[PDB]
Design an enzyme around this catalytic site. Structure first.
Site, PDB file in Angstrom:
ATOM      1  N   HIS A   1       1.265  -1.294   0.352  1.00 33.00           N
ATOM      2  CA  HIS A   1      -0.245   0.388  -0.151  1.00 33.00           C
ATOM      3  C   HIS A   1       0.484   1.175   0.273  1.00 33.00           C
ATOM      4  CE1 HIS A   1      -4.254   1.893   2.001  1.00 33.00           C
ATOM      5  NE2 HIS A   1      -3.819   1.891   0.096  1.00 33.00           N
TER       6      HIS A   1
ATOM      7  N   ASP B   1       7.533   4.633  -0.989  1.00 32.85           N
ATOM      8  CA  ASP B   1       8.447   3.423  -0.203  1.00 32.85           C
ATOM      9  C   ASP B   1       9.365   4.143  -1.678  1.00 32.85           C
ATOM     10  OD1 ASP B   1       8.582   2.662   2.223  1.00 32.85           O
ATOM     11  OD2 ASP B   1       6.692   1.236   1.371  1.00 32.85           O
TER      12      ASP B   1
END
Ligand SMILES: NC(=O)C1=CN([C@@H]2O[C@H](COP(=O)(O)OP(=O)(O)OC[C@H]3O[C@@H](n4cnc5c(N)ncnc54)[C@H](O)[C@@H]3O)[C@@H](O)[C@H]2O)C=CC1
Ligand SMILES: NC(=O)C1=CN([C@@H]2O[C@H](COP(=O)(O)OP(=O)(O)OC[C@H]3O[C@@H](n4cnc5c(N)ncnc54)[C@H](O)[C@@H]3O)[C@@H](O)[C@H]2O)C=CC1
Lengths: 469, 469
Positions: free
Chosen positions: A183, A268
């Site tokens: 996610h 990320d």
């Protein structure tokens, strides 16, 4: 009945997130929903079970919970198999984080800052283990092959890293029905918050590979909204400060990547830049602010120690719950045992979309199949999809990812995946050597040999050693 | 008439090779064959012309030779345009080699052994200039655009480096009818000689990208012949010694690449390995024998000085020929002015195949068009082809290149081409910076800025500076 199995259910908080979401989803919170919790660690498994049972009882949910130490028993006839397991050698370690921390330190001893597993476009700590991620890959492939035999309808929902490499290898080498889950896309909502935009009014899309995704469409009121990000960079970025080590979405590093690539990296992805942002701790602090992000020699050990204390505390909570069955976990620790608010993760919506046709848009790691037409059909991408009873339906990615993202970012990251898979299936140490021959921190070939040798010789790497021998 | 134009005809020996091959090819050695020799250097142009005229006269060939200082006059109505020009700034230099030697020394000053243009899989000296090869690319694109207007039937036969980058950019950005030329494939005949094999009995094929080609098929008497190479490695490689700095085909480096990739690199491909073979001069000598190959700080300056003396000597020969018109060049210097033996290069067979349907197999840089199906159709590859009046016909590449060649070698080299083209067309110094951020020799970002700055500030890089400014 509906059988949902959690492999690595000793991952207490994640297990509890899954259970609570199931117990708060009307179409799943049924007596015919059996949650199987499986793990190789007896004490952690028992703690997750005791807390999961109590939690459900306090949510007045009739779901059945089963714990088992048998992987086969958890896989047999399952409808969904969530793999969050992190393997380890129980003769030396108590959890998987220890093997990565120790290998990383050996890498640093030999001149590889943040370990040989930290590489350009893949700095996320613990994502790969000794490049080819042998024990993690090996477990996923073992599950896939058991699944095809004992559960041919199940979805293998891979959450353990490396999600990209593992999902690719399982798809390609077994054809098992694996889908990778992350996610990181959730970074977008902070972008909207910082630019003072109602998310419901933003027309946005993201796409790329796992931890390599880009805000390819960002539109507001019938126009490109990226000029609003240009204004924020000009007027707000100088005052930006991270709230914690994980807070990088609006950092100088992300905006520097935005300026070069033309689209903002999401989540990320911002951790996964080139070496420009990561040569050393001072450089990391310049580009991510005061903590230097989470992927450095100060913050990561600090975090892994927090996780250890949380593991012990939750286990203690399990014992406490046995001694004091009158306590209400939803009341004493509402943050860990909430009611009335779903977590927001994608796993249980995925299940409810497949099993109960509750259609939803998610971001999942699935084969390209032409969505990004400049890339092979079989390469696993992290794509925007709608999921229902009829399967997974990829959206059209418009605008396409920029030319620079393709040639400077996605393709290099895809080739690294192929390198890592080749290093696994060939069982050939020369392939690990070649990867380090492409590593900027390598100064000599003798250095590569020496660093791999010492990693291979670590006691808990006996299986790894024999595999490449 | 048949108009063959040589751009950069001051490249004396190559011009003479072309002229002599034309004069010894029955279907081309005609009064209706006009060879145009064009160059910006008056003295070198006049020397090539005087020698080319005398040479033809001694070969009793009726071809007409024309010298001109006008690029347009050479291009106008040409049927074939051979680009061997090497640009330079005449206020500072006398030939193009000087700008690469000086930039390379600045790169070494800043910690880039053999200059920033030496990179993994591209060590060939002078192949690229400051990564994006601005003056070389700029000239090729100028010729292509003039060609489309003034000579829409001509073939642009690109021999000046970077052949890969230039052929790709001209194809993609102009659609002009460019074909790239390099005879590195000729390495195969030494393989056959060392294994004691009649080349006429060997069923072989090579394919890849320019200076990145592989012996994908090597068969003898109805079997794979690679086991014969295995025997040679076991029994003869320990005794191998290079005859000169260019002799690398059967070197330890080539065999180490063979062992990893599964196919033998051919020709200049052997120079273009990973950094494993090139960290320093000692390492180069271990992997290429006593000279350390040709791409090092000792042998390359030595060679560029030999070329300078050869340039002056040939010029002197031109003057001598004027003063002593009675001398026979074919007799006094048969090595430079041979008769009865074609050179063996591919340029004149190409022309004779297009213009006179004299069908031949060549190895040419042309768009993939599905030949290597895992790569884009538009990427320029160095492929085995048959050429006739009907155009260029790609052979089927069987066996396919190995998986490791694709993911470890060809794709990284193709991406570097895309990086270099992006660095040219974007006019964006950040793209040059990104390339060096992917360079193993970079230690800091500040180092990248400083090395580019000093290169950009060199007097003869005024045009380059303004282009990126
Ligand atoms: N996307 C998400 O929401 C989350 C992703 N993850 C990912 O999964 C991986 C593990 O992370 P953590 O859970 O924090 O590590 P952890 O070490 O706390 O959990 C791993 C669990 O798996 C168990 N295990 C080890 N080998 C096993 C085996 N053969 N069979 C069954 N169980 C086994 C371990 O005993 C442990 O209880 C990480 O890569 C993480 O990123 C995990 C939590 C949530
Ligand atoms: N495949 C083959 O057979 C050969 C390939 N080449 C390649 O071509 C490139 C040049 O190599 P050399 O010939 O040895 O260098 P060189 O410097 O000796 O020849 C370059 C010639 O081009 C001239 N020139 C420079 N700018 C020009 C311009 N705008 N217009 C017309 N002429 C111009 C120069 O005055 C010079 O006479 C190299 O990359 C080389 O690899 C050249 C010779 C043969």
């Amino acid at each position: 009945h509906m059988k949902i199995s959690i492999i690595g259910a000793g991952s207490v908080r994640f297990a509890l997130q899954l259970v609570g979401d199931i117990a708060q989803t009307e179409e799943l919170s049924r007596e015919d929903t059996h949650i199987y919790m499986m793990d190789v660690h007896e004490r952690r498994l028992n703690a997750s079970y005791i807390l999961a049972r109590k939690y459900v009882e306090e949510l007045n949910s009739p779901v059945k919970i089963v714990k088992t130490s048998s992987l086969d028993e958890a896989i047999d006839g399952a409808d969904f198999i969530i793999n969050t397991a992190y393997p380890y050698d129980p003769r030396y370690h108590d959890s998987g984080s220890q093997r990565w921390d120790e290998v990383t330190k050996v890498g640093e001893k030999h001149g590889y800052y943040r370990g040989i597993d930290s590489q350009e476009l893949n700095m996320v700590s613990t994502y790969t283990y000794v490049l080819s991620s042998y024990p993690d890959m090996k477990l996923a492939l073992e599950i896939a092959e058991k699944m095809k035999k004992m559960a041919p309808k199940a979805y293998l929902m891979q959450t353990a890293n490396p999600v990209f490499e593992i999902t690719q290898a399982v798809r390609r080498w077994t054809g098992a029905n694996i889908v990778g889950f992350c996610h990181g896309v959730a970074g977008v909502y902070e972008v909207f918050e910082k630019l003072d935009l109602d998310p419901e009014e933003v027309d946005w899309q993201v796409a790329g590979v796992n931890h390599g995704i880009w805000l390819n469409r960002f539109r507001y009121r019938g126009e490109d909204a990226y000029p609003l990000l240009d204004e924020w960079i000009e007027k707000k970025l100088p005052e930006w400060e991270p709230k914690n080590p994980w807070d990088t979405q609006m950092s100088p590093a992300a905006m520097d990547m935005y300026k070069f690539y033309g689209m903002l990296p999401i989540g990320d992805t911002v951790r996964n830049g080139s070496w420009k942002y990561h040569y050393n701790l001072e450089t990391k602090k310049k580009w991510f602010g005061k903590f230097g992000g989470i992927d450095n020699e100060v913050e990561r050990p600090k975090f892994h120690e927090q996780l250890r204390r949380a593991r012990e505390r939750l286990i203690k909570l399990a014992e406490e719950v046995q001694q004091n069955p009158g306590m209400k976990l939803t009341e004493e620790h509402p943050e860990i045992f909430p009611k009335g608010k779903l977590s927001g993760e994608q796993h249980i919506p995925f299940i409810n979309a497949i099993a109960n046709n509750k259609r939803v848009r998610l971001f999942l790691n699935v084969e390209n199949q032409g969505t990004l037409k400049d890339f092979p059909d079989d390469v696993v991408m992290e794509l925007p999809v709608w999921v229902d009873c009829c399967g997974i339906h990829r959206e059209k990615v418009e605008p396409d990812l920029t030319h620079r993202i393709k040639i400077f970012y996605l393709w290099p990251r895809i080739l690294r995946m192929e390198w890592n898979l080749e290093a696994y299936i060939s069982r050939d140490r020369k392939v690990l050597e070649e990867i380090l021959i492409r590593d900027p921190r390598t100064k000599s070939y003798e250095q590569i040999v020496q660093v791999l040798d010492e990693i291979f010789n670590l006691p808990f790497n006996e299986e790894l050693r024999r595999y490449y021998k």
